[PDB]
Design a protein around this ligand. Structure first.
Ligand code: MG
Ligand code: MG
Ligand code: MG
Ligand code: MG
Ligand code: MG
Ligand code: MG
Ligand code: MG
Ligand code: MG
Ligand code: MG
Ligand code: MG
Ligand code: MG
Ligand code: MG
Ligand code: MG
Ligand code: MG
Ligand code: MG
Ligand code: MG
Ligand code: MG
Ligand code: MG
Ligand code: MG
Ligand code: MG
Ligand code: MG
Ligand code: MG
Ligand code: MG
Ligand code: MG
Ligand code: MG
Ligand code: MG
Lengths: 156, 129, 82, 205, 123, 80, 46
RNA sequence: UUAGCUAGUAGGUGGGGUAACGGCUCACCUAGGCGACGAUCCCUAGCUGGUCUGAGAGGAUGACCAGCCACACUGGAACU
RNA sequence: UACCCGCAGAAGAAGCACCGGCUAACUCCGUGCCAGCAGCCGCGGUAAUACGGAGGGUGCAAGCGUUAAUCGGAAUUACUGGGCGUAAAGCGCACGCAGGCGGUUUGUUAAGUCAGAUGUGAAAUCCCCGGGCUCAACCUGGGAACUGCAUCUGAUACUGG
C-alpha cells in the first residue's frame, strides 16, 4: 500500500588522521497516496544500507494531509531553512507542476494536481521539509468550520 | 508616532494569539469597533467589549480551538503608507474562500463575501485566515 | 467624396470583400469610416455570401455617399432576395 | 514525415506491445519484446524523472504514429480546450481518421489504415477524405469507397479486428464497410497503461 | 525598497553587455586573416591551439579560434567568424566558420560534418 | 454645466495674468501609491482681482497668448 | 604548419634557450590518481 | 560626472497678418516666464494599434498588416 | 487553374544533431596533455562511454545543427516578490525646510474611493462559440476583450478638505 521513493543520495565525508572517511546519505519519502506523507534521511557507509535506514525513518514519523479530490485545499506557503516553497491547488488534469524533491513528496502524498514553486534554496532535504510543513499546515473547510464555530455551508 | 491604529490592533490580536492570552485590550475607535464586530460575526473571536467614556477601551476575547489559536493569520492590506482599494470584481479571496477579507465599503465595514453580495468594492483593511 | 465600396480581404484565389463606407481618396484596404456589410463571391451552398446592413447604407447615401457598381449590384440582389 | 524504420524495435524500446503489427502472430515470437534494441539491450539503466516522462510521450506518439511538432500542436489544442488536458489530448489522438479506420477494422495496423486513407479508399460522410490527421467528429459515418471494397487486405483487417476487443464508441458494419463515429471516446474506454499525466507534465518544462 | 524610495528613484535593470561585440549583433562577419598562429592554453590544459587574428569587415581587430584538425588559412585569407569563445584561451571570443569563404572544411571527418563544413561522402 | 478646475495662485506678477498650480492626486502605475502631482497653468484674469496663494476656479478657452489658454471664473479663499 | 607565437618578444642571443623559458616548454606535472593531489570531488563519470 | 535656462524671452496695449485663435509679426509699456514634479544641454529614437516572451505583474520590441507623423539628391524659397 | 477520372509500376523521393553529468542515448579500435573537444563543470599524460573512426543507440525530420538576438528560468532591481549584526548593504551624530505619514469625536463636504449609466476606446490582431477551403495552416460571421479616459447620476465606511 505504501509507495516509497528515494529523492537524493549524496556522498559526504569526515576527515581523519588517515585520510577521508566517506559515507552516504539517502533522502527518501514515502506515502500512501491519500493523506499520509513521511520523509526520511538515512546515513550509512554504503548506499543501500543508508537508503534502507532512510526508508525505515520515513515509515515512522509520517503525517496526515487534508486533500480535496487529489489536490490541495488552498494556496499554501511553506518554509524551512533557506527553502521557501509555494503551492497552489490546480484543476484536474493539470498534473503535478513541481520542481525537484518537491515533485516526489507530492506524488507519494497523493496530490495529483498542483502548481508549485520553490523559492529560496532548493536544497533537497530542506525543500522536502518545507513542502511537508506546508502540507501539514494546510487546513480543510470542515476544520475551519469547526474552529470558527460555523457550518461548512456558511463559510463556502 | 502611532501612525496606524487598525494595524496596531491587529498586531495586538496576533500577539495575544501567540501568547495564549484570554483577552486583548486597546484604545477604542469606531473603525476598530466595527472591525471587531465583523470578526465576531465571522467567528474569529468570542466577544468584544467597549468600556469607558472619556477614553474608552476595546476588550476583545480571543478564541482558541483544540489548544491552538483560531486567528491563524491576520494581515493588514491597506496601510497609511500605501492604500489599497478594490472594485467588486477585484475583491480578494483569502485562503481560497475559507479566510475572510475585511473591507470598508460605502455601506460600512464588512467581509469580502458580504461586499461581493452587495455589489460593491472598497478599501481592503485586512485579511484574516 | 465619401463612397461605399468593397475592400479586398481574403487569401490568394479566395477573395472576401468587406463593404466599407470611406472617403474615396483613402486606399482600398486602408482608412474607412464604417464597415456596413460583407460579400463573399466564393461562398458555398447553405451559407450567406452577402450581408449588407441596409439601413446604414441608406443613411450614408442620404448624407451624400456614392456607391460602387458592385456594391449597387449586391444591394439589388439583397432587395430581390428579400 | 513518417517513421519508415523497423516497428518492433520501437515496441522493444517502450517495453510494451504497441500494436505496430497485425497481431496474426504474437509479438514474443517475432522479437525479444522484453529486451531493448541494440548491443546494450540486456542492461537496464535506471531511468530519470525526465526520462520516464519522455518515454511515456514517445510510447503514445509511436502508438498513433504522430511526429513531434504535430503532437505538440495537439497538446496545445488540448490545453486550450475545456476539461482535463491529458484526456483531451487522448480524445484528439483517437479522432484522427486513420486511427478511427484502424479501430473500425479496415486496417490491420494503424499504418495500414493510414496508407488506405492516403490512397483515397475512405469516405467521411460520402466525401473522399485523404488526410490521416483528419479529426472525425461525432455522428460522422466513415466508409470504404466502392473501388477499394474489393481489396483482400480490407477483409483480412476486418477479420483481425473481430478477434480483437471492439470499441464501445464506434458502430461498424462488416458487410457494408461503413462505421459510425458515435461519440468521442471517454478515458475509461481507452487503455489504462497510458499515463497521459506524464505527457502533460513534460509539455510544462 | 520603501515604495516612496522606489517612486523617487526606480529600480535599475541590470544592463548586460555582449560578449561578442565585434559581431555587432550580426550572426557572422567576414574578415581578413591579419596573422595566423598557435598559442598555449591556460592551465590546466596543454595544447597548441590554432588561432587567427582577423581584421573584420566592420573595422574590429579580433582574434578567432580555428576548430577541426588542420586548416588551410594563412595571411590574407578571407574568412567568416561566428562567435563563441574558447575558454582556455585568453581573449578568444569567436570561432571561424569551417566551409565558408577561404576556410576549408575539415579533411576526412565523418561525424558532426556540418559543424566542420564537410560534405556527405557519396557512395 | 462646464468643465472647470481649482488651484492656488503661485504667481500674479504678469499683468492680467496669473499662474495657477493645480494639484491632481493620481495613483502610481506600478507601485500603487497615490502621489500629489502638480499642473502649473498660465491663466488670464481681467481686472487683476486675484492675490498670490489665493484659491481660484478656472476654465479652458481659446488661447489668449503663447502660454495662456485658461481663464478664471471665480476666486475663493482669498485670505492673507 | 602554423607559427608558435612566443611570449619573448624579439629574440636576440639564442632562440631555443628563449623558448625553454616560455610557456610552451613549461613544466607539466600530472594530477595524482592516488596520493597527494588525488582527491576527486566527482568522478569522470559521476 | 548636464543646474541653472530665456529679451519676442513672459505678460499687457494698439496696429498689421492668418481661413482661423495666438509674440504669428511690429511699435510702445510692464519685468517677467521656465526649472530638483528635472528646466537647459548631451546621447539615442519615427509614434500607436500591435509583436515576442511571461502564470501574472512586468521585460523586450515596433519587419509584414492598418492608423498617424516626417522626408523625396543637399540647403533654401515661394508660385499655382 | 482548383477539383475529378484513367494509366503504369514500389516504382522518382531521408537527412541532421547528439550519446561524461546537466540530458534521452554505450561499446570496440586509433591516439597518448598530442591531436583535438567544450555551453558550464571539465576531458586528453597508453586500457578515453568526453578527442577521431566504426558498430549500436537517442532525439528531431524535409529538415537538422551552429551563430546572433529577446524574454524566460533570474524572487539575480523583488509593484505582485528580496534584503542590510557576522555573507554586498544603517549616513559618525544630530537639527531641520521641501516631501511622506498622522491620536480621538461630531458635523459638513464629496477630491480620492466605490456603484450604475452615457460617449469613446478604429479595423486587423489575442481569446470564445460558429462557418468556409478534403484537414490544417489560412480565410471568415457574431461575441467577448481593449484592464483606460471623460461626463452625468448616486453611496459616504475608509483617506482628503
Ligand atoms: Mg582525536
Ligand atoms: Mg512539416
Ligand atoms: Mg485543458
Ligand atoms: Mg493683437
Ligand atoms: Mg486687429
Ligand atoms: Mg533616426
Ligand atoms: Mg516570472
Ligand atoms: Mg539616393
Ligand atoms: Mg530641396
Ligand atoms: Mg556530453
Ligand atoms: Mg542519460
Ligand atoms: Mg562532439
Ligand atoms: Mg583507448
Ligand atoms: Mg566522441
Ligand atoms: Mg525578473
Ligand atoms: Mg538577497
Ligand atoms: Mg569581512
Ligand atoms: Mg559586511
Ligand atoms: Mg550608527
Ligand atoms: Mg485619522
Ligand atoms: Mg467623487
Ligand atoms: Mg466610475
Ligand atoms: Mg480593435
Ligand atoms: Mg471546417
Ligand atoms: Mg470624509
Ligand atoms: Mg473627515
Amino acid at each position: 500500500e505504501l509507495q516509497e521513493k528515494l529523492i537524493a543520495v549524496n556522498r559526504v565525508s569526515k576527515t581523519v588522521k588517515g585520510g577521508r572517511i566517506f559515507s552516504f546519505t539517502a533522502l527518501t519519502v514515502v506515502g500512501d497516496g491519500n493523506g499520509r506523507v513521511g520523509f526520511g534521511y538515512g546515513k550509512a557507509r554504503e548506499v543501500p544500507a543508508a537508503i534502507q535506514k532512510a526508508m525505515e525513518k520515513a515509515r515512522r514519523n509520517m503525517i496526515n494531509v487534508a486533500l480535496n479530490n487529489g489536490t490541495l485545499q488552498h494556496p499554501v506557503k511553506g518554509v524551512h531553512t533557506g527553502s521557501r516553497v509555494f503551492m497552489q491547488p490546480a484543476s484536474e488534469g493539470t498534473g503535478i507542476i513541481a520542481g525537484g524533491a518537491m515533485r516526489a513528496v507530492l506524488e507519494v502524498a497523493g496530490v495529483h494536481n498542483v502548481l508549485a514553486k520553490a523559492y529560496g534554496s532548493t536544497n533537497p532535504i530542506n525543500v522536502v521539509r518545507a513542502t511537508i510543513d506546508g502540507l501539514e499546515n494546510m487546513n480543510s473547510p470542515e476544520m475551519v468550520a469547526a474552529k470558527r464555530g460555523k457550518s461548512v455551508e456558511e463559510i463556502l | 508616532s502611532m501612525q496606524d491604529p487598525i494595524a496596531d490592533m491587529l498586531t495586538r490580536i496576533r500577539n495575544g494569539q501567540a501568547a495564549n492570552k484570554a483577552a486583548v485590550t486597546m484604545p477604542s475607535s469606531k473603525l476598530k469597533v466595527a472591525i471587531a464586530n465583523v470578526l465576531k460575526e465571522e467567528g474569529f473571536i468570542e466577544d468584544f467589549k467597549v468600556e469607558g467614556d472619556t477614553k474608552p477601551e476595546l476588550e476583545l476575547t480571543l478564541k482558541y480551538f483544540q489548544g491552538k489559536a483560531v486567528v491563524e493569520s491576520i494581515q493588514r492590506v491597506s496601510r497609511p503608507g500605501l492604500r489599497i482599494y478594490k472594485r467588486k470584481d477585484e475583491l480578494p479571496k483569502v485562503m481560497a474562500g475559507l479566510g475572510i477579507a475585511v473591507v470598508s465599503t460605502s455601506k460600512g465595514v464588512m467581509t469580502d463575501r458580504a461586499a461581493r453580495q452587495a455589489g460593491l468594492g472598497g478599501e481592503i483593511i485586512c485579511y484574516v485566515a | 467624396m465619401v463612397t461605399i465600396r468593397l475592400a479586398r480581404h481574403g487569401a490568394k484565389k479566395r477573395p472576401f470583400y468587406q463593404v466599407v463606407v470611406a472617403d474615396s481618396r483613402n486606399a482600398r484596404n486602408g482608412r474607412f469610416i464604417e464597415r456596413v456589410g460583407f460579400f463573399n463571391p466564393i461562398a458555398s451552398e447553405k451559407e450567406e455570401g452577402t450581408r449588407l446592413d441596409l439601413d446604414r447604407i441608406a443613411h450614408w447615401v442620404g448624407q451624400g455617399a456614392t456607391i460602387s457598381d458592385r456594391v449597387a449590384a449586391l444591394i439589388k440582389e439583397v432587395n430581390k432576395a428579400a | 514525415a513518417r517513421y519508415l524504420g523497423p516497428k518492433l524495435k520501437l515496441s522493444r524500446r517502450e517495453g510494451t506491445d504497441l500494436f505496430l503489427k497485425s497481431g496474426v502472430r504474437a509479438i514474443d515470437t517475432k522479437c525479444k519484446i522484453e529486451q531493448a534494441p541494440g548491443q546494450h539491450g540486456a542492461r537496464k539503466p535506471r531511468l530519470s524523472d525526465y526520462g520516464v516522462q519522455l518515454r511515456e510521450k514517445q510510447k503514445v506518439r509511436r502508438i498513433y504514429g504522430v511526429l513531434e511538432r504535430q503532437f505538440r500542436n495537439y497538446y496545445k489544442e488540448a490545453a486550450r480546450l475545456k476539461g482535463n488536458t491529458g484526456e483531451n489530448l487522448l480524445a484528439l489522438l483517437e479522432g484522427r481518421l486513420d486511427n478511427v479506420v484502424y479501430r473500425m477494422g479496415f486496417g490491420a495496423t494503424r499504418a495500414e489504415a493510414r496508407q488506405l486513407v492516403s490512397h483515397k479508399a475512405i469516405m467521411v460522410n460520402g466525401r473522399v477524405v485523404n488526410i490521416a490527421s483528419y479529426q472525425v467528429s461525432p455522428n460522422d459515418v466513415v466508409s470504404i469507397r466502392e473501388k477499394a471494397k474489393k481489396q483482400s487486405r480490407v477483409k483480412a483487417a476486418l477479420e483481425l479486428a473481430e478477434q480483437r476487443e471492439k470499441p464501445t464508441w464506434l458502430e461498424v458494419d462488416a458487410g457494408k464497410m461503413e462505421g459510425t463515429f458515435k461519440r468521442k471516446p471517454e478515458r475509461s474506454d481507452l487503455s489504462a497503461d497510458i499515463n497521459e499525466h506524464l505527457i502533460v507534465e513534460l509539455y510544462s518544462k | 525598497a520603501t515604495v516612496n524610495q522606489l517612486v523617487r528613484k526606480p529600480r535599475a535593470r541590470k544592463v548586460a553587455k555582449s560578449n561578442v561585440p565585434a559581431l555587432e549583433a550580426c550572426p557572422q562577419k567576414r574578415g581578413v586573416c591579419t596573422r595566423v598562429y598557435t598559442t598555449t592554453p591556460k592551465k590546466p590544459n596543454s595544447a597548441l591551439r590554432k588561432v587567427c587574428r582577423v581584421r573584420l569587415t566592420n573595422g574590429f581587430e579580433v582574434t578567432s579560434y580555428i576548430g577541426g584538425e588542420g586548416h588551410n588559412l594563412q595571411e590574407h585569407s578571407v574568412i567568416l567568424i561566428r562567435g563563441g569563445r574558447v575558454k582556455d584561451l585568453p581573449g578568444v571570443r569567436y570561432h571561424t566558420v569551417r566551409g565558408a569563404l577561404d576556410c576549408s572544411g575539415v579533411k576526412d571527418r565523418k561525424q558532426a560534418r556540418s559543424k566542420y563544413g564537410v560534405k556527405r561522402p557519396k557512395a | 454645466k462646464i468643465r472647470t478646475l481649482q488651484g492656488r495662485v503661485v504667481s500674479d506678477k504678469m499683468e492680467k495674468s496669473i499662474v495657477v498650480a493645480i494639484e491632481r492626486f493620481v495613483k502610481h502605475p506600478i507601485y500603487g501609491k497615490f502621489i500629489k502631482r502638480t499642473t502649473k497653468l498660465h491663466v488670464h484674469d481681467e481686472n487683476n482681482e486675484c492675490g498670490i496663494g489665493d484659491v481660484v476656479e478656472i476654465r479652458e478657452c481659446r488661447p489668449l497668448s503663447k502660454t495662456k489658454s485658461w481663464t478664471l471664473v471665480r476666486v475663493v479663499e482669498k485670505a492673507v | 604548419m602554423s607559427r608558435y607565437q612566443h611570449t619573448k618578444g624579439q629574440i636576440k642571443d639564442n632562440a631555443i634557450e628563449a623558448l625553454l623559458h616560455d610557456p610552451l616548454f613549461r613544466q607539466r606535472v600530472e594530477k595524482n590518481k592516488k596520493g597527494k593531489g588525488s582527491y576527486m570531488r566527482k568522478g569522470k563519470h559521476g
